Amino acid sequence: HHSSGLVPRGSMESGFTSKDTYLSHFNPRDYLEKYYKFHSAESQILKHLLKNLFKIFCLDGVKGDLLIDIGSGPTIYQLLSACESFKEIVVTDYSDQNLQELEKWLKAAPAAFDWSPVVTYVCDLEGNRVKGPEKEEKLRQAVKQVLKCDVTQSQPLGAVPLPPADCVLSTLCLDAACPDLPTYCRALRNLGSLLKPGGFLVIMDALKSSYYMIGEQKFSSLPLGREAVEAAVKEAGYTIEWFEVISQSYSSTMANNEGLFSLVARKL
Ligand SMILES: C[C@](O)(C/N=c1/sc2cccc3c2n1CCC3)C(=O)N1CCN(c2cccc3cnccc23)CC1
């Protein structure tokens, strides 16, 4: 995409990877093979996101009718615990390439990525009430829609009539989606329009990361800290229930994050 090494793809005119670059120059299966192979940085990070989700959805409250999952990418690790606390899930993404990988996975098509190592891992955290083939069927039955997203749009779902949600989940999304704090803050107001009053916001993402790599192809990220996200959340109409910060970072070659944040909020 012209630039090559000097600046992330689709970030020369703008200074941040434009949304177009996610539709055209983005291979989702290449990304899944890199980050979600699954005791490296990636595996340890995925294991921490998983523990936080098992605690949010299985250990604590966060029970409901409908959970809208914003910017799911081509991944399902983030929905394994919520398919126990929610009667229905509505997954979304900007990339059609990503929505495709999700739709292939809901069909159990052999050409879809293997989530077996991950699914079995979450089963072990839950005590193993069920096994992999049983856990994946609960989650697939729970996915009611796969829709196009745009957190950087007043109506994040467009014309789709969706009922108010009890939870809105977003993992590893807004750092790539928003190019500056005004957009990060606005994109959180947009998530609130999908949420019920006193409804949960669950956000997980990297801290202090300005880029992330998918091979040799580079992508933009918003380098923000704990103070920056804490402030962005509260100003967008949310009361923060708890905020976790971990020091684990992605390997040298994969991103310059100083750690990762996990937080639960409530639309107030
Ligand atoms: C693969 C992935 O890039 C997500 N993976 C990762 S792995 C990793 C590792 C380290 C750091 C980071 C990181 N990231 C996210 C960025 C930070 C993806 O699938 N994303 C995020 C970007 N996203 C959108 C783009 C533009 C506009 C959007 C509008 N609405 C909704 C979504 C939109 C689409 C879904």
Side-chain angles (χ1 to χ4, degrees), residues 1-8 10-38 40-268:
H1 203 18
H2 306 150
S3 315
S4 81
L6 294 123
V7 89
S11 77
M12 180 197 81
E13 193 145 5
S14 39
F16 202 100
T17 290
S18 83
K19 299 188 295 179
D20 115 81
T21 2
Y22 281 101
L23 305 179
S24 51
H25 303 62
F26 171 74
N27 190 257
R29 335 142 170 264
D30 271 308
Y31 163 79
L32 289 158
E33 257 74 44
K34 274 144 207 74
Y35 289 87
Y36 302 100
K37 13 90 245 61
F38 200 77
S40 75
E42 291 67 71
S43 294
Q44 309 281 77
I45 285 163
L46 175 50
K47 292 160 185 179
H48 202 65
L49 301 165
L50 288 185
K51 289 180 231 209
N52 281 335
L53 298 161
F54 166 80
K55 170 149 187 317
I56 301 165
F57 303 120
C58 296
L59 234 45
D60 286 281
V62 207
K63 282 273 187 161
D65 264 48
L66 181 80
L67 193 169
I68 295 167
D69 183 53
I70 301 292
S72 328
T75 87
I76 61 106
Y77 70 88
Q78 70 275 8
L79 324 164
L80 289 162
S81 290
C83 75
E84 307 287 343
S85 302
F86 290 90
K87 284 94 234 168
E88 288 156 324
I89 300 169
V90 164
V91 315
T92 76
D93 205 67
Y94 191 78
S95 294
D96 327 283
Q97 327 202 227
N98 275 340
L99 298 176
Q100 173 212 37
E101 276 305 301
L102 281 174
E103 257 140 339
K104 282 208 245 283
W105 190 79
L106 264 313
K107 275 152 74 178
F113 193 72
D114 190 30
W115 288 94
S116 306
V118 173
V119 172
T120 304
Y121 188 77
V122 177
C123 272
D124 316 326
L125 296 164
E126 305 177 347
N128 250 118
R129 302 274 301 175
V130 307
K131 286 119 113 325
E134 218 178 321
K135 184 75 173 168
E136 255 161 309
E137 194 57 41
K138 189 147 183 66
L139 181 51
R140 286 165 160 145
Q141 273 172 35
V143 181
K144 262 63 188 87
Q145 290 213 75
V146 189
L147 293 173
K148 215 242 188 50
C149 211
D150 209 349
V151 288
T152 71
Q153 274 309 125
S154 305
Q155 251 196 308
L157 295 177
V160 193
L162 264 192
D166 296 35
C167 184
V168 156
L169 170 69
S170 201
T171 75
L172 301 165
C173 168
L174 299 157
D175 274 24
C178 320
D180 46 78
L181 194 81
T183 326
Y184 190 94
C185 190
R186 280 184 271 197
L188 286 178
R189 278 192 188 91
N190 297 357
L191 304 167
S193 73
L194 290 192
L195 260 168
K196 274 182 182 171
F200 295 97
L201 186 98
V202 178
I203 309 295
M204 312 210 288
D205 219 339
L207 283 175
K208 283 132 160 187
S209 174
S210 65
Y211 75 88
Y212 78 90
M213 318 247 358
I214 309 183
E216 202 59 40
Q217 333 296 79
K218 195 194 314 178
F219 291 91
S220 301
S221 219
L222 196 53
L224 27 54
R226 187 222 152 83
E227 305 76 26
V229 295
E230 191 212 7
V233 169
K234 299 190 296 193
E235 276 267 300
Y238 310 87
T239 210
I240 304 183
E241 303 284 85
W242 62 256
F243 195 118
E244 191 219 40
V245 132
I246 53 254
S247 100
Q248 177 79 89
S249 291
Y250 287 98
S251 299
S252 54
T253 66
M254 307 249 91
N256 63 345
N257 64 316
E258 270 87 283
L260 289 129
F261 75 95
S262 198
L263 81 96
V264 161
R266 271 217 221 194
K267 192 178 179 190
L268 247 59

